[PDB]
């Protein structure tokens, strides 16, 4: 249509047409709403739109239009106020104040246009932040004086004061300079004595609700910062804890105020203040017990019904009780007349802890952690909470959530399946529950065991049989592992495991047998100390795990393999020795039947089994016996490896068979799995396959390039090429795994390195970009990390083969080849760290690209790239400084010092790299400190001769910042650089000066004296 006419500012603004575009946006839909959206944004973004705000506030009949007008003024006041002449600033102030008073005195507008008035109050506060009090010292006296003329004006004055307190004390850290925030903080602190009078009077005498609620809402903000005497040396605590708790329309905001009072670290030596802190808590709990609910109420059912504000009130009550008791409960623990209050409050928390609400449970659980940890150490306190803790044991045992190890879960259709995603929130909640229950067990082991032994009895006889009930109980049993002593724990677990061994072979069903299998496996995996001292049990356990590896359910199979590793990581000594009443070490029995045991396991679970055997075999430290145990274990993969190597030296096509690719990759995956658990002990097995594996790597590499030439780049997506590249990735992963754990570095350099680089480097360099495996870069990083100091020519070769070609892949955008970006800068980091000489061997053009690569990593929003890039620049500067006064170091500063200084200033100030501010500040401070410590023994310019680098640096940065931020006065830039220079050894203050600069570049007229804050 013709809605764009309002964007023409030559003619008068059609107020009516504006009101239609606004109504089309908010109330419309589809294209006309999107059309009106782009028009309203353009109208709002016009630098002259604020001059039309006067007539929009007068002649418009649409509240949303007046809202947008205020947003246009808000941008003016926040960013360009100090550029207007003195008459415009007074003019805008007057008609904002005039409109506010106008809307308050009209009683009907005061009720119907709450949004427009709130937007006006916030806008007025933006003027206060610019003008008050140095140009409006009578604001608070006038505001207090106008409060008595009208009750609407008074209620709105509480909103203005609330907003002002928020902007000065709660949201000023990142929006004002340090000097400005300190200025407005002192200004409000000076005038608060007269603000509390108005607040207390309105609270003492009180009209009806609305004005009280707005007053209490403003008080909640004052409690963040005002002195304690305003709270304890007046009657306001008696008003909050009694009067404003009775009426439900002020109960919520009063409860939030009392929570804020409860959070203060009161003078712990004043018997009077302790008396008032006990008093308002006693009054609050009495008001709840008589006006809201008694201590015996089913808050779980109250919260589930969700009537009115019940859920928010119970949330705020939980927050009030935990905040107060975590800080002041000692005030109640000694006096015997305060005991019932102390226990009724905790009984409310017990009832609150039965609500089905994850986040609310975490809140009350956080306090229970605070309590039981104190009862664990503080003498003579446990007995006070004996009945509270006993109830708490029931609650936590019945609300245990599923730990990591349990891979079986009930599905949305009621079937017990295997979990596909890991629930990080559930895992953390289980650990928090375990931490509390472990403390609760220490506080009374007898009570804990009886609850668990009684619940298990009613699980065994079907009286309370339930998937939920057998799971929570079993997870609670495993979580308290380590709290009982041996013999005491011996008694306990033999009992538990037996009934679980029973229940397992009593309940028939695909689902039931899988629920008990996971509970058995979790409990048993949590008690290795018991399994160590009972080989007969451990062997029975291990054989049940093998029996679970033959079940149909993949989750039971997976957990059996994970439980096997978990047990073996702690009990591996009992597998290598000849146990009494045994024919051989149990590892020898496992290795022999390894084909039968793993007959039904999928490949990635067979590999986990082999990794578990590798943990056992590494316990044996007899070199001959272990290397033989290693050979016995790898028989099947080596036998299959010899076959696909005997018939592969001839007939190269065998590798191309899809089934053979899957077999080859699983063989290498088994070698990776074992090498992970054995580390440096894997060397005998690695050498048995190493030279053949690298030829296989060459054979696979040629086939890959042949496919891409025959089929195109699309070949890299096919299952065939994807399968071949897996062999390359698994080969690199195996070599990287070993070298990362190798102890015999001489063997690595003399035997492993030279065939590795020959097989991977030119293959990576001469493949097309889409065929390059980022795992090559990852492998070279481990080489340079572990033996980089022993192969200075290998590091040079690594650079030449990957540096330029990988940099070209990742320097056109920020998202193509994401795994290459991460591994690329990880490699450049370790080379620049442990083998910096390789960069000295780069041609000056290739060193220019190196600096370009570092700064390119600055501008990444990817934290994996951004962090490494700032670390490389920091280490490069240190590497250059350690060289001293040589041509390369002097050439470096001449060519690159100001490139690093300016590229660091760019990402500091572009508002798009806030996540790396700390490391950016650290880099800029190191660069500035170089000049002001005379560590650069050459001139940085090509300015009259004899001038210092200190002087040129200041002239350079002042000129740089002047052109980049032209709206800054010369003295703003001068004072900022002066402070930034004096502070280049004090990172905290240096970062404070930078943050003050980032505030000032967002507005006009920043005070240059702000940089003298320190």
């Amino acid at each position: 249509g013709s809605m764009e006419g309002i964007l023409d500012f030559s003619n008068d603004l059609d107020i009516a047409l504006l009101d239609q575009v606004v109504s089309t946006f908010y109330q419309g839909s589809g294209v006309q709403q999107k059309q009106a959206q782009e028009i309203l944004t353009k109208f709002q973004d016009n630098p002259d739109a604020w001059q039309k705000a006067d007539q929009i506030l007068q002649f418009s009949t649409n509240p949303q239009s007046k809202f947008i007008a205020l947003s246009i003024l808000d941008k003016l006041i926040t960013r360009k106020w100090k550029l207007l002449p003195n008459d415009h600033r007074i003019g805008i102030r007057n008609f904002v104040v005039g409109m506010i008073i106008s809307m308050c005195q009209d009683d009907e507008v005061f009720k119907t246009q709450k949004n427009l008035i709130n937007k006006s109050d916030l806008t007025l506060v933006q003027i206060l932040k610019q003008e008050w009090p140095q140009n409006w010292p009578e604001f608070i006296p006038e505001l207090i004086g106008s409060s008595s003329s009208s009750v609407n004006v008074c209620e709105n004055n509480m909103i203005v004061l609330k907003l002002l307190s928020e902007e000065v004390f709660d949201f000023s850290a990142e929006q004002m300079t340090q000097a400005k925030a300190l200025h407005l903080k002192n200004s409000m602190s000076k005038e608060f004595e007269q603000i509390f009078k108005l607040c207390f009077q309105v609270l003492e005498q009180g009209s009806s609700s609305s004005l009280i609620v707005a007053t209490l809402e403003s008080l909640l903000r004052y409690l963040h910062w005002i002195p304690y005497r305003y709270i304890y040396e007046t009657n306001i605590l008696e008003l909050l804890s009694t009067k404003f708790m009775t009426s439900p329309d002020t109960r919520a905001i009063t409860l939030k105020c009392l929570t804020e009072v409860s959070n203060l670290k009161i003078p712990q030596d004043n018997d009077l203040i302790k008396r008032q802190t006990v008093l308002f808590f006693q009054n609050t709990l009495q008001q709840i017990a008589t006006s809201v609910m008694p201590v015996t109420a089913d808050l779980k059912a109250t919260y589930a019904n969700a009537n009115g504000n019940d859920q928010s009130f119970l949330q705020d009550l939980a927050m009030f009780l935990t905040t107060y008791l975590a800080r002041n409960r000692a005030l109640l623990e000694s006096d015997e007349s305060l005991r019932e209050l102390l226990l009724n409050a905790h009984q409310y928390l017990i009832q609150l802890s039965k609500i089905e609400e994850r986040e609310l449970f975490k809140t009350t659980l956080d306090y229970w952690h605070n309590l039981v940890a104190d009862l664990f150490y503080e003498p003579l306190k446990k007995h006070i909470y004996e009945e509270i803790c006993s109830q708490l044991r029931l609650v936590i045992i019945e609300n245990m959530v599923r730990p990591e190890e349990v891979l079986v879960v009930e599905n949305d259709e009621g079937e017990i399946v295997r979990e596909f995603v890991k629930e990080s929130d559930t895992i953390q909640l289980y650990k928090s529950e375990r931490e509390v229950l472990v403390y609760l067990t220490h506080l009374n082991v007898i009570d804990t065991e009886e609850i668990m032994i009684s619940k298990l009895a009613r699980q065994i006889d079907g009286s309370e049989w339930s998937w939920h009930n057998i799971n929570t109980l079993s997870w609670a049993i495993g979580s308290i592992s380590g709290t009982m002593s041996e013999d005491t724990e011996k008694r306990f677990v033999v009992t538990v495991i037996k009934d679980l061994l029973g229940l397992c072979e009593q309940k028939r069903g695909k689902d039931n047998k899988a629920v008990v299998a996971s509970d058995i496996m979790y409990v048993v995996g949590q008690y290795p100390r018991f399994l160590k001292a009972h080989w007969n049990f451990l062997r029975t356990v291990i054989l049940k795990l093998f029996k679970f590896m033959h079940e149909t359910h993949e989750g039971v199979q997976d957990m059996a393999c994970d439980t096997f590793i978990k047990i073996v990581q702690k009990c591996k000594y009992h597998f290598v020795i000849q146990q009494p009443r045994e024919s051989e070490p149990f590892i020898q029995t496992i290795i022999r039947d390894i084909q039968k045991t793993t007959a039904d396991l999928q490949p990635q679970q067979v590999h986990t089994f082999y990794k578990a055997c590798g943990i056992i075999i590494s316990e044996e430290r007899s070199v001959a016996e272990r290397n033989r145990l290693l050979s016995d274990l790898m028989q099947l993969p080596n036998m299959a490896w010899d076959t696909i190597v005997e018939q592969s030296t001839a007939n190269p096509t065998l590798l191309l068979d899809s089934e053979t690719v899957k077999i080859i990759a699983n063989i290498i995956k088994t070698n990776v799995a074992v090498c992970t658990s054995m580390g440096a002990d894997f060397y005998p097995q690695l050498g048995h396959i190493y030279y053949n594996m690298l030829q296989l790597y060459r054979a696979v590499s040629s086939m890959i390039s042949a496919q891409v030439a025959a089929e195109g780049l699309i070949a890299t997506k096919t299952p065939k090429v994807r399968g071949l590249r897996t062999i390359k990735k698994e080969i690199l992963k195996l070599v990287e795994t070993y070298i990362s754990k190798a102890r015999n570095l001489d063997d690595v350099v003399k035997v492993l390195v030279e065939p590795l680089l020959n097989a991977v480097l030119e293959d990576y360099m001469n493949n097309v970009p889409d065929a390059r495996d980022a795992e090559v870069l990852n492998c070279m990083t481990t080489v340079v990390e572990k033996v980089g100091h022993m192969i200075p020519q290998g590091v040079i070769l690594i650079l030449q083969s990957v540096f330029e070609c990988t940099l070209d892949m990742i320097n056109k955008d920020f998202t193509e080849y994401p795994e290459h970006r991460v591994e690329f800068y990880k490699l450049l980091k370790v080379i620049n760290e442990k083998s910096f000489a390789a960069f000295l061997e780069l041609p000056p053009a290739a060193f220019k690209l190196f600096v370009d690569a570092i700064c390119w990593a600055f501008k990444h929003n990817n934290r994996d790239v951004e962090v490494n890039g700032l670390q490389i620049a920091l280490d490069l500067v240190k590497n250059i400084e350690r060289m001293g006064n040589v041509p390369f170091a002097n050439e470096f500063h001449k060519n690159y010092f100001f490139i690093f200084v300016s590229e660091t200033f760019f990402v500091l100030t572009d508002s798009d790299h806030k996540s790396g501010f700390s490391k950016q500040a650290l880099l800029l401070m190191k660069l500035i400190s170089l000049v002001y410590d005379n560590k650069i023994s050459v001139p940085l310019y090509q300015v009259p001769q004899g001038t210092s680098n200190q002087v040129y640096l200041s002239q350079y940065l002042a000129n740089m910042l002047s052109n980049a931020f032209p709206h800054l006065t010369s003295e703003q830039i001068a004072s900022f650089l002066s402070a930034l220079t004096k502070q280049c050894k004090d990172l905290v203050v240096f970062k404070g000066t930078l943050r003050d600069f980032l505030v000032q570049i967002k507005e006009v007229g920043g005070d240059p004296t702000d940089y003298l804050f320190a």
Partner: protein, 123 residues
Amino acid sequence: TMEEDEEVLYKVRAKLFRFDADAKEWKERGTGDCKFLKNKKTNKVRILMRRDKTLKICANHIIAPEYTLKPNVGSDRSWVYACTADIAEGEAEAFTFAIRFGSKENADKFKEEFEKAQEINKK
């Protein structure tokens, strides 16, 4: 629910894609149970597929005998085919679907069942 007059002939977990020919890329449309539903009255079999948690329909069309399953270049566990009338998003639209399964075994079993259901609608 409009499913009681139907019998389930085949069920399998799958991921469904639609081809955005403009951008020349595959876009996901849903993950959940793919079902072959034979109407007990008219004996015509349809594909009905709902997204996991929301249970919103992402596939709803007759397994017409004129449809043919073709492999995708980068998958051995997927099938591609055109659909001239799917009503998952309302009015009958035309789509080029792709459906992926957890394994090649599931993908072959699907093609067996997909063709078995085609012979049913051919009467």
